[PDB]
Design a protein around this ligand. Structure first.
Ligand code: 22S
Ligand code: 22S
Ligand code: 22S
Ligand code: 22S
Lengths: 809, 809
């Protein structure tokens, strides 16, 4: 029906129908009489996956023949979402499958809704890994994603009485048609034990063994016939494990628990042994796999054939593990091993919040990984010798830069380990990378300035435009062709349409259709009703104090109080939508969810308000939900305290899909405003420098409370029980935090935020001018393609050239 | 190459090759460059399983249309072995697949060796269930096998220093191509909780829920296009289970442990809570499935449409569970519910050893299954009221017959429950069924004589002749056609060939070839060497004192001592093979294994013995090993103390495959001798009556030691450390048991056994007469087909007619 979804040729449609019926019969063992809708989904998934096979085999044999430098992207998170539509998109099969299923009497969109998200990540860091895999395949790089196959991904969030409840995400229950188990590449991973010193080197002995079994998932490039691999490890007990008899068999669970569940903390470090085991498990298995592949091509050439990218410090044990293998097993001298390690590894930092940095207690590494601790001590000694020689007599520099932190419990600073052992260190947006050089890692930058880079984040325009917003993709393609899908900078061509009345109409129409579709989704699957003519004001992202969902809450209550004060004045109607999961042990984030729903309970049932203001909490925010809500949004809320959000990627998704942004000058927001023009962005609030100034003289929230009467009213409503009549003191913790211990200065940005929101309402009253500003945002979103990001990693870090050329079909 | 393996037509061979290549590519994602031998096995398994699909769908739709009475065979064990060859045999595909793989450059037999046994049983009881499924499908009955899908089956046995070591049988590691998960028929099973009484009935509340997920495995009939289902339940935690967060997810293992591992006790009861949970789990899920299927056809008609066969007392909770559903959920009155239950259920007993009978402590049922305990008390009260009315004043009868056993701990006698709640009770061989009426269940037989039946055990001639011994099957088919494969009584026709010189030669030749093949197997995969001209003397079965592997050991040492006494006399050379697993907690059985290997260590390295006597312990005896060794055997050792082996089925396998039998008049041995003629069987030892007489006056082993000098020598060799020079007292427990507490009267049968063994050696010196006696055994083995057994269950218990007619192809 629409052009960018590909051809529906008669031979292809006929073949798809035939293969669908074959899988339903021979694979699922069903006929049309008994087949459940889930069966039809699986028949389609098997039909589509068949098309990946030849390309997957020939891609991997091509890398074997050509032997290019291989890129290994190590991450504890890969937030993939659904795979069916994405695979159709990248193979140009969407229209053909739509037609084939139509002719079989089935609605493809309904079948798509049956697929479980692969929710193997928490938020931005996990989703970045996923966008990256897509871009690496689209750019023809010999790339492999390596991670853990968690049996349970991020929990499903249910809201009960306004409170978050967690349930297990049993995503493999029905089986995963997108993975192939590879038991023949099963590898042993070692834990505990002790170090023995002999005449010729150290030996790690008396270890416990866990097996690492790999599962391969295809990663198709966009219409280039490239299919790369994401290899995820699953933990298996050896067969002689604990081998009264019954108990020994049941105890296999202890070993297999390593790959059981994703830790649900976003930007927070928890020093739990099971998490450390997960980190080593992925690193040990991956490195053996890498080395095995390299030998099937002398370690001088290792860095010419291997790049390892560490996604934050979670896989930081790769550094001492590589040293361990090179020194203990291969018998290289320390200095040569070290040279190889440094040239091989690169590190990407994703946060500056101190509570998020990994600092592992020494006693934990001592017991679990005794040889790695010894290697880390040796790395530290040699590194600090270099610091002492460069900055003679600077004894405080020595303690600041040490990988070993002194105190009550001695800890290892994993970020310091990553910097010492990597040839490149990057932040994820220009302002974040600057903050790294100026504050957090200032000492390291002074020692080795050449190591520090920026690589501004991006998103894939395949999932985040073509897949989720075909209507917008189509009206764009009608004017500029479809080359922009893998060359997003071409969207600049749309600037010459900003005065085109047909395009203005079409852009506004597509947004309207998306909003109608989302309004319908809400009624059908949540029995909740909304006005589709209102401004859709959306903040979706994990719940964190730094992200300031609370600031948004204050604005919502402000609008409610103004309406109640002057009921008969006109206000631009809004649907305010907030969604996101809270980490299970994060009390304040759970209280914020409760506040949001409690505000909704008052606002949504006030007769005087009518349909002028609605507050909805979007339950179970995840990749599939984002694909629905982002295309429907008018206003994107990106309101973190300046200096706290390293980049953001949600911001970029909204920009690409025709929402305007209200935001602080934080993370990639700065670069977004710079690309679009500050006139085309709703910027408010303290800059980083303003935050610094306030910290110096001291942040007194009371001052704001005292001079802003509208703010005072809200605090008094919260305190007195206006939003919780049966438990009047319910929100006391929130009020006390705001008044006395707010690290994120919510009150300080309140006035500017409200005034900026008034300017948004003003522009939305003028549909034509709203839409022209939207066009200027979409047209300048090109920089934020992860294809650009990956091309920069490739050229400036990995030392490889991207290729847009297609492999034989 | 051989006729009974079917046709290798040009179209079929071409199609198989094509589909093999398709699965290797599209299913396994491999090409011929990287494909492992395991990959080739899977490609073949998928190619063969494709042929089951249409037949499986049409069989099940046929049962839906015709609505015949359904047979539900409930067992905690299904000892299936490998599935690939069996499926080819039953579909007539063996020659075609042999040819197709040959043309692809592959050896099919080598691919067959890659398949894991489905080892979901311990021994005879589990293997009986498997033979039964085959016969039910071959006889066109609407039958379903229901059990548990254990993640770990019977342990793999390794012998280390002559001692048994157990390792986990991780049989699902590579995935099982013969099962289809059916998540849409997932059912809840309830545990713990409490009983609440209301105005209208009892209610079972506050329960913990475990989910039962079914996996279906096809059971093909022999060339009749019937494909029945074996449905095995797997335990799954609900998603809100235990729902700090991490621990709650890891604790799901506690619920899922129910289906983790098969209890490895053969003929021994262990009152462990996990075992009780397994028994209820299979019963609760199965009964809901049965009832659901019945409603998709008023409970008066229930027994006309449903038969439930209880394989021993392990699924005895079906009786109170059916009552529970009928009374509590469907609101039938007690007496009507009871009538339905009794007419529906039948019970098969498999043992008379008191330590094997299930007697569950009341306190365990009280906590785990409070409502079932109440129902059991009520059943008992009403039953004992009937006993009191039939035998007024007989107060000891009342205590003897009670389902509740008094004592230190009150227990429930599950066998008494089964008798009370079933319309039929059967033993598994004529002598065993007689023993049930005369001793163990005498009181019950006097109350309800009509309930008691015999159904002599059988084995399937598909697996146990055609599959494992194609050479023998072929020379038979050459003379009498191939109808005997599903009508085994036709083997009587072979009696007119007992004087045929060509047939005599062919029978002897096939045995020789089988022995050469097995001698080669032993060298290749165990580096052990044997003389293929020797008499192959085989005892394979689980290790138990009652089975008297120890009596066999005494004979072996006797032969060794005689050789050493007169080294230069001629003796018929023997290879004595003993194999079987010991239950992990059964100390004496583990000591017997150690004795066997210790005897081998002395005998096999004595230069004076040469190749005249060899003693081999066959490691890891299981269904696949039985298929190899049974066709190779000359002498079958079936030497249990009279009255202890209920039937035996191993005995029948050897008879069908051309071994002669040395045995006591125990279990089915009696009926075997009766069929073949006592002159054609090597019978020795006490009859049941002789055992009874000895028990009355008291068994004194010392008497035998005192008057048999050859026996005295052996005991002195054992005691003094002749067979364990470094640990002279190693076998003290064995000697003390033999001398002072032998329940199985090993010494009492010693003299007769040795003399009978001399007669065996004498006949083996005359090849022509040995073979004529073999022909007389094979020719009269027809009675022992499980087709006969199942036809009797069908007509005399289930009330259904078997059909040899084929369904549309
Ligand atoms: O269907 C569920 C099972 O599927 C198996 N996949 C098999 S057999 N082939 N996959 C082929 C494949 C896989 C991915 C992409 C393309 C193809 Cl063409 C996985 O190994 C199991 O771990 C999983 O449980
Ligand atoms: O670069 C991608 C995105 O990365 C995010 N970081 C995240 S989700 N870290 N999770 C860290 C984490 C995850 C799990 C466990 C412990 C921790 Cl400590 C940043 O906050 C975003 O500003 C940025 O856009
Ligand atoms: O390959 C391993 C996986 O296979 C799956 N089987 C599928 S998809 N089809 N089976 C079809 C089938 C099954 C049996 C007989 C004939 C056919 Cl035609 C099982 O449901 C999984 O539990 C198992 O792990
Ligand atoms: O009828 C088939 C065969 O049944 C065997 N019984 C067996 S394996 N019981 N296992 C009982 C068992 C099994 C598991 C756990 C506890 C127990 Cl208590 C008989 O000993 C044979 O003489 C007979 O041929």
């Amino acid at each position: 029906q629409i052009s960018v979804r590909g051809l529906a040729g008669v031979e292809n449609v006929t073949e798809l129908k035939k293969n669908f019926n074959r899988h339903l019969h021979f694979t699922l063992v069903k006929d049309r009489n008994v087949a459940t809708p889930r069966d039809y989904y699986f028949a389609l998934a098997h039909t589509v996956r068949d098309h990946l096979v030849g390309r997957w085999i020939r891609t991997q044999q091509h890398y074997y023949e050509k032997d290019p430098k291989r890129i290994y992207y190590l991450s504890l998170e890969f937030y993939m979402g659904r795979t069916l539509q994405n695979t159709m998109v990248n193979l140009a099969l969407e229209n053909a499958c739509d037609e084939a299923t139509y002719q079989l009497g089935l609605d493809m969109e309904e079948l798509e809704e049956i697929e479980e998200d692969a929710g193997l990540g928490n938020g931005g860091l996990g989703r970045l890994a996923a966008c990256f895999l897509d871009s690496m395949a689209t750019l023809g790089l010999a790339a492999y994603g390596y991670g853990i196959r968690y049996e349970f991904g991020i929990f499903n969030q249910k809201i009960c009485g306004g409170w978050q409840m967690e349930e297990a995400d049993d995503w493999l229950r029905y089986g995963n048609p997108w993975e192939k188990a590879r038991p023949e590449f099963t590898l042993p991973v070692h834990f505990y034990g002790r170090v023995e010193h002999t005449s010729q080197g150290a030996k790690w002995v008396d270890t416990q063994v866990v097996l690492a079994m790999p599962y391969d998932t295809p990663v198709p490039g966009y219409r280039n016939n490239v299919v790369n691999t994401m290899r995820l490890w699953s933990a298996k007990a050896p067969n002689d494990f604990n081998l009264g008899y019954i108990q020994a068999v049941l105890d296999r669970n202890l070993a297999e628990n390593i790959s059981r569940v994703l830790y649900p903390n976003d930007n927070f470090f928890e020093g739990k042994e099971l998490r450390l085991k997960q980190e080593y498990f992925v690193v040990a298995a991956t490195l053996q796999d890498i080395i095995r592949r390299f030998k099937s091509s002398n370690f001088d050439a290792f860095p010419d054939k291997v790049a390892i990218q560490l996604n934050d410090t979670h896989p930081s044990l790769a550094i001492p593990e590589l040293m361990r293998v090179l020194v203990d097993l291969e018998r290289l001298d320390w200095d040569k091993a070290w040279e190889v390690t440094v040239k091989t590894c690169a590190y990407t930092n994703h946060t500056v919040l101190p509570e998020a940095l990994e600092r592992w207690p020494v006693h934990l590494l001592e017991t679990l990984l005794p040889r790695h601790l010894q290697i880390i001590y040796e790395i530290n000694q040699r590194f600090l010798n270099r610091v002492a020689a460069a900055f003679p007599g600077d004894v405080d520099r020595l303690r600041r830069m040490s990988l070993v932190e002194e105190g009550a419990v001695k800890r290892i600073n994993m970020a310091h380990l990553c910097i010492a052992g990597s040839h490149a260190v990057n932040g994820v947006a220009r302002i974040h990378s600057e903050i790294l050089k100026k504050t957090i890692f200032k000492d390291f930058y002074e020692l080795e300035p050449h190591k520090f880079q920026n690589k501004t984040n991006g998103i894939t325009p395949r999932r985040w435009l073509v897949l989720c917003n075909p209507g917008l993709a189509e009206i764009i393609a009608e004017r500029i062709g479809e080359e922009y899908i893998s060359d997003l900078d071409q969207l600049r061509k749309l600037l010459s349409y900003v005065d085109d009345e047909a395009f203005i109409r079409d852009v506004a129409k597509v947004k309207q259709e998306n909003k109608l579709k989302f309004a319908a989704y809400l009624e059908r699957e949540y029995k909740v009703h909304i006005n589709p003519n209102s401004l859709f004001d959306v903040q979706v992202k994990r719940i964190h104090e730094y992200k300031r969902q609370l600031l948004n809450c204050l604005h919502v209550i402000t609008l409610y109080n103004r309406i109640k004060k002057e009921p008969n004045k006109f206000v631009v109607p809004r649907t305010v939508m907030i969604g996101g999961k809270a980490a299970p042990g994060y009390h304040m984030a759970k209280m914020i969810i409760k506040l949001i729903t409690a505000i909704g309970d008052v606002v949504n049932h006030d007769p005087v308000v009518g349909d002028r203001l609605r507050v909805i909490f979007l339950e179970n925010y995840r990749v599939s939900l984002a694909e629905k809500v982002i295309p429907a949004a008018d206003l994107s809320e990106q309101i973190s305290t300046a200096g706290t959000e390293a980049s953001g990627t949600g911001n970029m998704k909204f920009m690409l899909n025709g929402a305007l942004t209200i935001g602080t000058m934080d993370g990639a927001n700065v670069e977004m405003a710079e690309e679009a023009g500050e006139e085309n962005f709703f910027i408010f609030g303290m800059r980083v420098e303003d935050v610094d100034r306030l910290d110096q003289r001291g942040y007194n929230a009371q001052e704001y409370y005292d001079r802003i009467p509208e703010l005072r009213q809200i605090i008094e409503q919260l305190s007195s029980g206006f939003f919780s009549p049966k438990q009047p003191d319910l929100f006391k913790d929130i009020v006390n935090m705001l008044m006395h211990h707010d690290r994120f200065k919510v009150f300080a940005d309140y006035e500017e935020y409200v005034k900026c929101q008034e300017r948004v309402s003003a522009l939305y009253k003028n549909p034509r001018e709203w839409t022209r500003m939207v066009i200027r945002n979409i047209a300048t979103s090109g920089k934020f393609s992860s294809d650009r990001t990956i091309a920069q990693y490739a050229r400036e870090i990995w030392g490889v050239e991207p290729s847009r050329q297609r492999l034989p079909a």
